[PDB]
mmCIF file of C-alpha atoms in Angstrom:
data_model
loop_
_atom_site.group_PDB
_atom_site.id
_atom_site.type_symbol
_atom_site.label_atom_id
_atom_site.label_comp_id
_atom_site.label_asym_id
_atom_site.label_seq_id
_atom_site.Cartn_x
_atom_site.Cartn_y
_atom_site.Cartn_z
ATOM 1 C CA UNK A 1 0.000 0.000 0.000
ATOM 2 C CA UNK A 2 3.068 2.694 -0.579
ATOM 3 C CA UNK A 3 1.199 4.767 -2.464
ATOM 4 C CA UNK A 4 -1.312 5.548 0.007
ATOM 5 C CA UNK A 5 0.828 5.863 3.117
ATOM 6 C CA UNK A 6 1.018 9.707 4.172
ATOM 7 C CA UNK A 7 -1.559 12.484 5.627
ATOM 8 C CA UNK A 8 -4.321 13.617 3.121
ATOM 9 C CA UNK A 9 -6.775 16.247 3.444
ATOM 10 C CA UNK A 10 -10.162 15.937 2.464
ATOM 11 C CA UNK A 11 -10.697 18.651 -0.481
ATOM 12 C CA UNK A 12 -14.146 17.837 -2.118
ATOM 13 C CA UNK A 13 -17.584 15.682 -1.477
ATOM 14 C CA UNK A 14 -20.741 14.729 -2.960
ATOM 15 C CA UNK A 15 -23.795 13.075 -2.301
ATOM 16 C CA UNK A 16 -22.319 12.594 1.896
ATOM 17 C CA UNK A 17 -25.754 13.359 2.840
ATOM 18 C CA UNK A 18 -27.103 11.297 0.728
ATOM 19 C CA UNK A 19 -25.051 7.964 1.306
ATOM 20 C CA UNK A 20 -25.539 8.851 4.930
ATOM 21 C CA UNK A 21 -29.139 8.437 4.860
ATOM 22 C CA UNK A 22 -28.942 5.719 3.083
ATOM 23 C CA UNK A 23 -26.755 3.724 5.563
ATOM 24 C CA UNK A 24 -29.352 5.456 8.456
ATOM 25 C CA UNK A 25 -27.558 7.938 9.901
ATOM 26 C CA UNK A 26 -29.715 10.760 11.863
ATOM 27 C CA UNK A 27 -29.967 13.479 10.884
ATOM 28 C CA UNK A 28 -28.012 15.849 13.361
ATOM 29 C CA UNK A 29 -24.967 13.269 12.677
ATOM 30 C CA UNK A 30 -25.290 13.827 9.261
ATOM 31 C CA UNK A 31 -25.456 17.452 9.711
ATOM 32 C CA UNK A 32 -22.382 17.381 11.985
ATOM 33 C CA UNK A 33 -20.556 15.161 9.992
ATOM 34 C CA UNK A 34 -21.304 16.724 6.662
ATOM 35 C CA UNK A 35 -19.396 19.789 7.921
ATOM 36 C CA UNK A 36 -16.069 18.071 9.018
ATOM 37 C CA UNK A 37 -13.013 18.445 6.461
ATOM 38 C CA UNK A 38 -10.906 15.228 8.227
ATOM 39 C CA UNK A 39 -7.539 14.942 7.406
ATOM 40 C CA UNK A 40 -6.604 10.761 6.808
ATOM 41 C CA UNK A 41 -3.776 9.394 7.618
ATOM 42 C CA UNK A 42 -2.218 6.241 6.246
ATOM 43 C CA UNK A 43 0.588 3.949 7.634
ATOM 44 C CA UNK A 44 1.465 0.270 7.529
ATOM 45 C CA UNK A 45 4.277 -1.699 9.365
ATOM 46 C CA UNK A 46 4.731 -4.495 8.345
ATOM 47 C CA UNK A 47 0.965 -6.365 7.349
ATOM 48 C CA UNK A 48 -0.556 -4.162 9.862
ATOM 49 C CA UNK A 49 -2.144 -1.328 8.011
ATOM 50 C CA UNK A 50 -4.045 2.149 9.931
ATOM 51 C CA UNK A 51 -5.867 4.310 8.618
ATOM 52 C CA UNK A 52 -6.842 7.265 10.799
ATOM 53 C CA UNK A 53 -9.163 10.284 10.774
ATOM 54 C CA UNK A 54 -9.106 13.665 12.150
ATOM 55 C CA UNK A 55 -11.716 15.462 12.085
ATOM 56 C CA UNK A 56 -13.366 18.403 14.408
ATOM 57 C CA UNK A 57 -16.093 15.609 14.358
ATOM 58 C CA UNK A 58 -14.944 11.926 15.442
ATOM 59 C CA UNK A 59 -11.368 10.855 15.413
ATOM 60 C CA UNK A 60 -11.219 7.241 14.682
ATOM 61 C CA UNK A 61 -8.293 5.079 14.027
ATOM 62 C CA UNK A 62 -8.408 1.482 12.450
ATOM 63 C CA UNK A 63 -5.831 -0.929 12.313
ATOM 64 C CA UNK A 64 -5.674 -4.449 10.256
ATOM 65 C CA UNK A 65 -4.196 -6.768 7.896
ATOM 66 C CA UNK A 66 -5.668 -7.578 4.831
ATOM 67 C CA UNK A 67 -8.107 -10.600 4.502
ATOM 68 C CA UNK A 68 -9.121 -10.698 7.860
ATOM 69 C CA UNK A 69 -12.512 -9.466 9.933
ATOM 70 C CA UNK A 70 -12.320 -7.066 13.089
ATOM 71 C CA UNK A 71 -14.310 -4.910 14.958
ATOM 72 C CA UNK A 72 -14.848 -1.645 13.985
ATOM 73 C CA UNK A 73 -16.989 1.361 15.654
ATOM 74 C CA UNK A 74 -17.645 3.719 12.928
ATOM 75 C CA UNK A 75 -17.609 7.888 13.438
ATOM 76 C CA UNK A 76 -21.382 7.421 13.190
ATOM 77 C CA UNK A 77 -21.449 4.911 16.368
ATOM 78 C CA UNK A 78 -22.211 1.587 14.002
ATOM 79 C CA UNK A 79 -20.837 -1.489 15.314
ATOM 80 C CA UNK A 80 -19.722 -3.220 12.605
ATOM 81 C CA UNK A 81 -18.072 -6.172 11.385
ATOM 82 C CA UNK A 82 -14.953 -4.887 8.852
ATOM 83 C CA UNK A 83 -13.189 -6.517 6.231
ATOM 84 C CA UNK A 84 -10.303 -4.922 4.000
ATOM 85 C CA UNK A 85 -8.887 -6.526 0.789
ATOM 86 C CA UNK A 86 -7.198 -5.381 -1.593
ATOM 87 C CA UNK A 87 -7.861 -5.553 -5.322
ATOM 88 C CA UNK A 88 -6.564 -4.468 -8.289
ATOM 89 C CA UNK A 89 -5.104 -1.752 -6.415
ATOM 90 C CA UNK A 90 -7.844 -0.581 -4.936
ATOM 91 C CA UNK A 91 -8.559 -0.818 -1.412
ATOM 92 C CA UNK A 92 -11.790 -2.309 -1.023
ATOM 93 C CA UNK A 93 -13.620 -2.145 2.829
ATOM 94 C CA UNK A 94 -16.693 -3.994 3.009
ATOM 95 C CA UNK A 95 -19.078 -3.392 6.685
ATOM 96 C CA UNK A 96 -21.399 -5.793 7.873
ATOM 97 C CA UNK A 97 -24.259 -4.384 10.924
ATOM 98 C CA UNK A 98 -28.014 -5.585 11.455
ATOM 99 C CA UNK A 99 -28.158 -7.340 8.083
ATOM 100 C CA UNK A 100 -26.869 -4.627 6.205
ATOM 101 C CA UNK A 101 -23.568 -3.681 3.864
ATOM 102 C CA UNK A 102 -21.734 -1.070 2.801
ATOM 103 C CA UNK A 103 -18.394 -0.877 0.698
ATOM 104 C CA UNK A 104 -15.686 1.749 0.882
ATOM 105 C CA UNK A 105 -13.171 1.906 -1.946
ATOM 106 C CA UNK A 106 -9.929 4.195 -1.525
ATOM 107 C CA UNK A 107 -8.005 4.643 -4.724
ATOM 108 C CA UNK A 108 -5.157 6.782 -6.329
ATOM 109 C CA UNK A 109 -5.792 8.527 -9.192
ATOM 110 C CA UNK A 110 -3.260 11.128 -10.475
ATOM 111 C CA UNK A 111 -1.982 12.783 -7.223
ATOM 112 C CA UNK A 112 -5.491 12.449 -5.521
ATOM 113 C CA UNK A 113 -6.841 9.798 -3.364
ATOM 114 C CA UNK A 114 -10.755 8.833 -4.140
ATOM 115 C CA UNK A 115 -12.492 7.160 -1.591
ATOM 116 C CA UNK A 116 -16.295 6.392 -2.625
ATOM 117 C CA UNK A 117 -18.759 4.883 -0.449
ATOM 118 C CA UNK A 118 -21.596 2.967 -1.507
ATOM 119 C CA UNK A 119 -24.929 2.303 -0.003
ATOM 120 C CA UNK A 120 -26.779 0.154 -2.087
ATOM 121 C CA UNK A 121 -28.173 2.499 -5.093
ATOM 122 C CA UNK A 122 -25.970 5.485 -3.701
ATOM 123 C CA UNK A 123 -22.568 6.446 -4.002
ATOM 124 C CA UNK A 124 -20.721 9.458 -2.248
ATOM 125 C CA UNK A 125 -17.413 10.583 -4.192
ATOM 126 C CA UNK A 126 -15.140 11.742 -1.356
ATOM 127 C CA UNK A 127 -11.553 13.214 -2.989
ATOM 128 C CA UNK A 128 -8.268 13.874 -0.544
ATOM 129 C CA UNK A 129 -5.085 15.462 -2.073
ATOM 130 C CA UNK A 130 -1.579 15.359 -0.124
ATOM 131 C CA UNK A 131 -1.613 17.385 3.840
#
């Protein structure tokens, strides 16, 4: 994952709101959330890979290796169930909760990196450049 590691700054959204309903967040999360510009922050040692938010909002921090489930508590307060793979390049984070899914997909592209989450029918386009 070298070409994610660093600190990047979250420069542009769409549709947050949106995808956030759709995974059932209320709404003065989402209104609270939907403000925050988070800065994430990418590291790995060894097969152990974190990824960790700032934000004015919710800090979180997750740690994991590849291929295999943990325990996640998202900003949002879901427990879920997390697995990260990655494929084709593209980091591909799947979360199980109460029978439902949602997949978060972090790619580079050019000197940007595009995370999009997707909530059945809805997709939120979040784009970070370098801190």
């Amino acid at each position: 994952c070298d070409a994610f590691v660093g600190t990047w700054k979250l420069v542009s959204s769409e549709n947050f709101d949106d995808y956030m309903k759709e995974v059932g967040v209320g709404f003065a999360t989402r209104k609270v959330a939907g403000m925050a510009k988070p800065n994430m922050i990418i590291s790995v040692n060894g097969d152990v890979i974190t990824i960790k938010s700032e934000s004015t909002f919710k800090n979180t921090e997750i740690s994991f290796i590849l291929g295999q489930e943990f325990d996640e508590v998202t900003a949002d307060d879901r427990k879920v169930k997390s697995t990260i793979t990655l494929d084709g390049g593209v980091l591909v984070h799947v979360q199980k909760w109460d029978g439902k899914s949602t997949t978060i997909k972090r790619k580079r592209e050019d000197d940007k990196l595009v995370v999009e989450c997707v909530m059945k029918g809805v997709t939120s386009t979040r784009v970070y450049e370098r801190a």
